[PDB]
């Protein structure tokens with residue numbers, strides 16, 4: 551009879567819905583229809599029904615079957631990283647057939663700084679797949695992967711259930727950033743809940759504590775990246791280990807010239823010809839302002855380098871263009887660190 555109390559079915563059957571969750575959603579509506587300003591149940595089910603709609607099922611993005619188009623971008627987001635470029639392609643060649651992903655999840659390990667999350671961005675762009683990230687740092691219980699019960703207010707579903715609410719497709723690229731930091735002390739171990747989400751036998755029967763009914767996940771392509779090897783043994787099993795650590799000066803220079811410099815020039819509100827940073831200034835950042843195997847502090851210095859450039863142009867409009875080389879790099883980054 552009311553407006554919102556009647557506008558619940560406007561997205562239960564209008565939006566797609568499976569079989570076991572169809573009438574079960576209305577079975578949860580059975581606890582309603584009695585009153586409306588009532589509290590507890592009349593306020594939890596409406597939130598529960600709301601969380602039952604924003605979750606995607608029978609709705610996905612079309613993944614292509616092409617292969618070189620992925621090779622065409624695995625050299626775009628970087629270059630190839632010597633080898634390993636083929637691996638990512640080798641993994642996507644077998645996934646171009648039956649939808650059950652099934653294979654070892656893929657694990658991008660290495661020192662902090664190496665393109666781990668960035669590689670996860672390209673694999674989603676390669677297969678036309680949507681991207682979402684879930685950092686596994688600070689998780690110390692099972693109440694994160696699998697949500698809480700359907701108690702009073704607050705008890706929201708699992709973290710992955712909330713990520714599916716954003717990316718409204720059944721086939722997103724779920725990144726598990728830094729699985730090393732995943733602690734297992736409080737409520738059992740999140741690795742047990744992390745097994746049923748990637749294991750091919752029970753990924754289709756993933757049950758969340760809040761969202762009562764199960765939720766298929768055999769169409770999601772998971773990418774679990776980290777740094778060290780401190781991961782639970784049942785997780786390392788059935789996961790493809792990909793190691794990448796080495797980074798030379800010339801490799802850091804190429805990454806900065808193709809990606810790090812164009813990215814920070816744009817973010818810092820600089821136009822195309824407003825800032826020129828030649829190769830010596832990039833090398834000077836590597837040798838005296840950043841010590842690292844990856845390129846994170848290399849990118850941290852450019853975010854400051856382009857920062858001061860837009861500052862100098864704003865404090866002196868008589869400047870149309872700032873040039874930074876190995877000689878005047880210390881005027882912007884301050885004194886050298888190493």
Ligand SMILES: Nc1ncnc2c1ncn2[C@@H]1O[C@H](COP(=O)(O)OP(=O)(O)O)[C@@H](O)[C@H]1O
Pocket residue numbers: 627628629631661662663664665666667668669805809810844845846849
């Ligand atoms: N080999 C690389 N090629 C291109 N860009 C890179 C590379 N390595 C790192 N990056 C840059 O680093 C950023 C993200 O770093 P990330 O890989 O997330 O660090 P971490 O692995 O420590 O989380 C991206 O924006 C990306 O442009």
